[PDB]
């Protein structure tokens, strides 16, 4: 296959594409934006101005399988064609059974057969516009459509590998404590799957404290029905709902993996506020609180990916990034600092603003992606090392201090909007990328004096070669007292600086 | 003739032009804008940017017959020529005896002979710059010129049918309780015409209350003079005055109908405020109050057409639209909402901003006519049906609910400027056009659940074929919970067209 | 001669240029703008945008005769060349002995010899930078150079007639009660010239009150010395000073008139405020108060021309326009209303904003001159008749009524900037030009009703033929209740309207 | 050599370049702007828009000698090439041992050997990022590199003379009362050099009060150690530190002078506030207070050059301009007034805004340089004479009166931004350049009346010939009552040039 996840020396998962480490400098289209060839083709030139390397775009089951057994390849065909013509990779979004909790993208022949494909019921007994995750018939229909899609992708793309990742469904779950369908209620009375029990026992010291505390509160039992093992409460309800989602979607993914395995991720509508109970957000989705349940249930799903529109970016990304879960953000705000923090601090696979086609005039973002592209080789090389960090000022922070081998780095912010990344490339050498901050280098060991030796501003050409534009000294470095990450000038955007240091 | 009104199966009057249903997406020029070939010709390109299909433009008697029996075809010729070259149909306004009550467009030779063509007199006795509607000499001279104009149009236009309608005179009436000319004072004493009596008897249940009440108050008599049948008051004065105008102009139209019958309408300066008495507005004009009088008196006038510049649009158009009177608005404000309301709610024949050449920079208006043009086939097919409605928010309204077959539609407004139309094209299919509203779809039968099935955005190509630009879903329909008529986007927004399918479960 | 003043049938003086009535739609250059060929030549395209037919431009003695007996024809020749090439007539301003009272344009060799060309002396005995009008040497040297200039103009322009008028000196006079030079003091003691006395006797009825009153206060004597005849005061001082200036300058003009007679005018710095005594303004210059002295002393000067920069435009022009003195305004503000008033109300020969080259972006002014040009034939034909008026609103006015044959015209203003002119061209026909006013037509005879019959908007083409652009009616004339002079549209400027009227 | 300092008849030092007097209408690049060929080459077109005749740009030892004995001529070669292609002369800044006090441009191989190239030590005893001026190894290595640079310049530029001046180091000195290195402390105990005693003896009447008063307070001794001759205090510490810097840098210049002598200047960071003690500003630098020490110690340095960023411009330039020290300003604000004052009042060799490449859209400054270029021959001819003054208004001044032979010039300002220069070219002739002032000419001798005779506005063509654009008179001169220096117009305004003839009567 031409896209794969491989763990490196530092234990970081890396995307390897056409043989090389690859980071998704991405954007996701608006939902409806891949729904005709003409609309989508109107967007490519805009997207190129933002220096994307990857576009996240949906295929909708309703359009792909408009009658059961009849498949329409027009949209996937034209999407791959356009991506190729414009220099983009694709992550394909599969709007099948569920998109933002609901089943609005299910085919007309699925919506109209509520007997074959039964709906979630509310606590009031109302059927809603959401297929039950307890509907086996819907699992199989969706699984067959998705497998057919991926078979086709293999058939037209196995060599070029334009398509580098798959997202089955979109923000799954219910806005309810549980499904009140008959199958849902019976499933709630069933034995906890041993797969979950075994996973927990094994990974206890590492479990989410949301799972652990409920399990332990009820005696950390290794058998029994859901209400025995996890109590009769909102949490046991969320846990068997999430199991069911993860199990249904795993089946969908397995069918594809069997024929053409690509990096596969499921995305979540975040727990918006800390007190929110399951059902305020989609109950069933891969939010961090149930990461363990998803991992135990869905081994054919590679990454649980947060959709981040909230300002608390640093805490959110640390919450979702685990040793078994690389940071992959398929939906975010169009804020360059977020990208630098994800890639630099957490070795992210993907950063993707939602509704990217709308932000074509965002020069600073475009230039930021340009700088990140220059740095992909160096970022890739240091993924997972303690020699790479992000830089992003949040309100009310004034400075950050870190150790890097022989040196202490004191990062001070010159504006609210200050961001970048720092890589130690050598005992006495650093690459600093970004804008509106300064870095002071001193000696860890206080029996020595550490100082900047020399600073060059530059960038990497299309060959990947470093080309210095200036040797920054004098006013530009306060006589080598400090690195000033002023940025590249046209308006200001992130710059790249090579700093050599010395001890004496 | 290449233009005619035909009633369809729902009872609605349609304009058939060159053998196809036609709706006037119109504009009327300022009054003096067709007075030379050069000035008119300077406007065509401006008008084209507005996506007009029809231009309303005057021929003035003073220019058409500058000396008695001498006719100048220069202006009508070049008007037709320009419309053809720029893709417009024409409705011709005839500024003859009267324009805005007065006779400023009568030929020099008519103005100068106050013996042959006597004037209205005021209550203090002064002759005003208005030819009396009791002056038979004026009626015949006007009729002969109008007839001469229409013969010419036939002669140069019978095969092409650039000209699709005629408006004899413009906003007729006097700013007086009555004319005080000796001939007027005599007329008022005369017997009420049996045509009026018989009309009232036969059409009683549909009569205006302003006429029925006065008739009824004076004993609903079936003979007698004006003052006997209608009392001695301002209303009987308005009635015999209105009868007079309708009679005079009917003759002018009939001469034209005899040789080249075109759809013909007369237009009114509205009763401007609800208490206004005849004379505050032109007394004699076809305001809704005297609609039955005009109908009884002028069978050669097809349509009485309101000139709407007031903000109370919905009430006004509902007042003028009757079984026997299609909605045709030759003068209006340049407001896209108004057009959508007239065409969608009332199946109108015409919507026409006055002074249209001034609005060439109104992109939202332009794109509104663009969308309406795409919809003419569909509008025309649903005229008079309960399966077509307008949408237009007015201040202080928040939402409208209607039933369409198996579905309830709740229309909710997302801004003050919200307008469009809705057409049910199938048991489970709707076309919704417009901007700044939302439509919630539910089952009429409470035992079932109705939902949106699928939503497409698009438009009709030049071949008249539907082309979807998107399948709107997810964010764009709140996951099929609602239709969002956000509009077509250039940001600036103008009306969009959405095809919505629904289902029951 | 290609230019001459000729009294028409109504007693109005007209300029006949190349055998046709001509009206100067003029502007005057800044003082230093014709001092080189290059600087003047840079202006002509600007001037053309303003639709001038005439430029007022100086020739400076200092440059024309830089050494005595040596004449430099460069500036005059290039000026005429440029005018011809750009479609302009010229009125030549002679900056000789005096310009704004002073002698700053006298040649170096005149300035440097205060023995030969003695200066004015102040009451304190200081010699000022003004040559004395009692210095005959200066008079003869000025006259000789001026004659040399006009002779040259004849030799290069007699057939073409680019030059249509001359202005000897500029705003002459002293900022003193009298000149205190020896010659001035002796001149004051002398007998009143018999030419003055006889002028006053013959024209007594029509004399300026300012001259009559002083004469009559002292016995209306027909002989005696200046202080005998006019008493010992500021006025007698002003009179003999004014007599001196007009005599000196009459000699200069006479020399030119002898070989090549052109319409000749002297311009004044106005009495700025009503109380102002002679010498607050240049004492000697042709202000209206001393118009009779100038007329008596200077028959070779055709017109006395006010320079009008003050806002009391209408009273000022009325004060200068007399039966023996056509209105000619060589210096003014760039206000189109003033032009329309001068030409329409007072049959003026010339309207000329000062510093015209500054005004090249004045669209409204330029279009005003376009309209006046279209109107020149019609204006010409009605000069001095009671069938032509101007229209100009001043603050605090709002309507003018006038009678014209059978009709009363009520002119009502729709804005503060309201101006134009009205010509009755027939018993029942009028041409109205202008902007921001309305005209109501009624019958003078109350037994009749007068009304507008028909209105056309239009203009005159380059052949002088009327071309209508619209028949205005309906909204555009309130159904013939009124003529609306709305203007030509692009921003609005004066329009031209033909109105027929009728009586019933 | 194609660039030389030479004293004229009025005792003024002039720069003679390619046989002709030359004034630097200059600008200095940002520090890092000459660090690659690509970055510098991106600037030339911009620099041309400002009408510079000279660029000040650095060469950095760290790049010129990247390893000891290995020399990289890329940057100097490219700089000379670009200067030639764009019509500029160069003054080369040597960022060697010190730049703004510190050793940040010293080679990596100098930085890393603190044994061979020992550092300044603080009073606390810390070694700082500054090479001690008491380090002979450092002096020798800097000297060797500097000579290599200049030998190369000779080798590629001896005929053309693009390079017209040299600045060794940049704003040298320590932010300390003294260096606490062992060498420094022991040099403080040494005998005052006789070269300094002798200078102070010979030049006593012309000494800086700052040096003289301290010498005299300790008994004006002609022998002893620093603390003997100058006391034990901050000043004797400043004196010997300054001696050391000037001595070190003189050695550096001498090596260049011996193979290819060019006008050489050292620049100083100014005493920023009058109370400031040595060390607040760089202690060692050629500030005016220690001008005598620098002259005595460094005969191979031609000029001491102030870097002027402060608003008190007139006082500062007067402070630095002495008979033995022409005014040369390598670093200044981009203010045209400062240029006119420097060149006009003080016959300056050079005016140079710092960060010049940032200033490319400064039209008025570009036009001022255009006018100064036009005037260079006339400025050159009157350098040092009392027939040439500058004009510059400072806040809270309103007029300046000067005597010029037979006339008195009253200069009155019409705006806050009023500047230029005045030359008497003849007994009765002046050239006035500038903007926003007026000049009144009267007679010195009150028994005569002096007046303007004629005024011409104009300029000098590419051949150096005067061409009048106007004879100014009437309103333009208030009838020759005054010269109005209105400026050249474009309305945006910049300096004009006016020729005024006067006369006495
Ligand atoms: C309507 O979109 C959804 O909004 C939610 C908050 O209400 C979350 O942000 C989800 O990620 C997003 O897909
Ligand atoms: C002056 O125009 C007229 O104005 C009236 C109100 O005054 C009505 O609006 C008429 O319809 C309109 O034609």
UniProtKB/TrEMBL annotation, chains A, C:
Entry's Gene Ontology molecular function annotations: hydrolase activity, hydrolyzing O-glycosyl compounds
GO BP: any one term: carbohydrate metabolic process
Pfam families: DUF5597, Glyco_hydro_35
Entry binding sites for alpha-D-galactose: 31, 99-100, 170, 331, 475
Listed InterPro entries: DUF5597, GH, Gly_Hdrlase_35_cat, Glycoside_Hdrlase_35
Signal peptide start and end residues: none
Residue ranges occupied by any Glycoside hydrolase 35 catalytic domain in the UniProt entry: 14-204
Annotated DUF5597 domain residues: 365-479
PANTHER family: BETA-GALACTOSIDASE RELATED
Annotated family: Belongs to the glycosyl hydrolase 35 family.
Protein name in the entry: Beta-galactosidase
Lineage: Bacteria, Pseudomonadati, Bacteroidota, Bacteroidia, Bacteroidales
């Amino acid at each position: 296959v031409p896209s794969r996840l491989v763990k490196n020396e530092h234990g970081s998962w890396q995307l390897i594409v056409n043989g090389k480490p690859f980071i998704m400098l991405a954007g996701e289209l608006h939902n409806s934006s891949a729904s005709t060839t003409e609309y989508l083709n109107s967007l490519w030139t805009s997207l190129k101005t933002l220096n994307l390397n990857t576009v996240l775009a949906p295929i909708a089951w309703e359009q792909f399988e408009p009658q059961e057994g009849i498949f329409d390849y027009t949209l996937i065909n034209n999407m791959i064609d356009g991506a190729r013509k414009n220099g983009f990779k694709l992550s394909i979004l599969w709007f099948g059974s569920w998109k933002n909790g609901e089943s609005s993208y299910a085919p007309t022949w699925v919506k109209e057969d509520t007997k074959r494909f039964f709906r979630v019921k509310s606590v009031e007994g109302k059927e809603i516009e959401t297929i039950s995750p307890f509907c086996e018939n819907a699992m199989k229909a969706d699984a067959k459509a998705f497998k057919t899609l991926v078979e086709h992708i293999k058939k037209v793309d196995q060599a070029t590998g334009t398509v580098i990742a798959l997202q089955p469904e979109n923000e799954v779950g219910i806005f309810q404590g549980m499904d009140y369908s008959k199958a849902s209620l019976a499933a709630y009375e069933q034995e906890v799957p041993q797969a979950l029990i075994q996973y927990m026992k094994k990974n206890r010291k590492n479990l989410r404290k949301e799972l652990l505390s409920v399990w332990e509160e009820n005696g950390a039992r290794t058998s029994g029905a859901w209400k025995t093992v996890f109590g009769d409460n909102a949490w046991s309800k969320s846990f068997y709902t999430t199991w069911q989602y993860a199990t249904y979607i795993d089946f969908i993914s397995a069918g594809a993996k069997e024929i053409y395995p690509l990096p596969t991720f499921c995305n979540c509508w975040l727990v918006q506020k800390p007190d929110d109970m399951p059902g305020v957000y989609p109950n069933g989705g891969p939010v961090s609180r149930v990461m363990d349940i998803w991992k135990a249930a869905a081994p054919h799903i590679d990454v649980l990916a947060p959709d981040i529109y909230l300002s608390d970016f640093k805490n959110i990304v640390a919450d979702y990034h685990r040793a078994d879960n690389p940071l992959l953000i398929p939906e975010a705000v169009m804020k360059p600092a977020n990208a630098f923090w994800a890639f630099g601090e957490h070795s992210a696979l993907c950063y993707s603003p939602f509704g990217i086609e709308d932000g074509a005039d965002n020069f600073v973002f475009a230039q930021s992606y340009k700088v990140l592209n220059e740095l992909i080789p160096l970022i890739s090389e240091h993924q997972g090392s303690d020699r790479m960090i992000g830089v992003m000022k949040m309100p009310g922070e004034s400075e950050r201090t870190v150790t890097m081998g022989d040196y202490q780095l004191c990062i001070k912010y010159d504006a609210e909007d200050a961001y970048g990344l720092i890589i130690q490339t050598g005992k006495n050498e650093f690459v600093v990328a970004g804008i509106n901050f300064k870095v002071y280098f001193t000696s860890t060991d206080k029996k020595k004096t550490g100082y900047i030796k020399q600073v060059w501003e530059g960038g990497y050409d299309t060959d990947g070669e470093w080309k210095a534009t200036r040797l920054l000294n004098g006013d530009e470095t306060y006589h080598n007292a400090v690195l000033i990450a002023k940025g590249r000038r046209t308006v200001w955007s992130p710059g790249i600086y090579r700093v050599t240091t010395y001890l004496r």
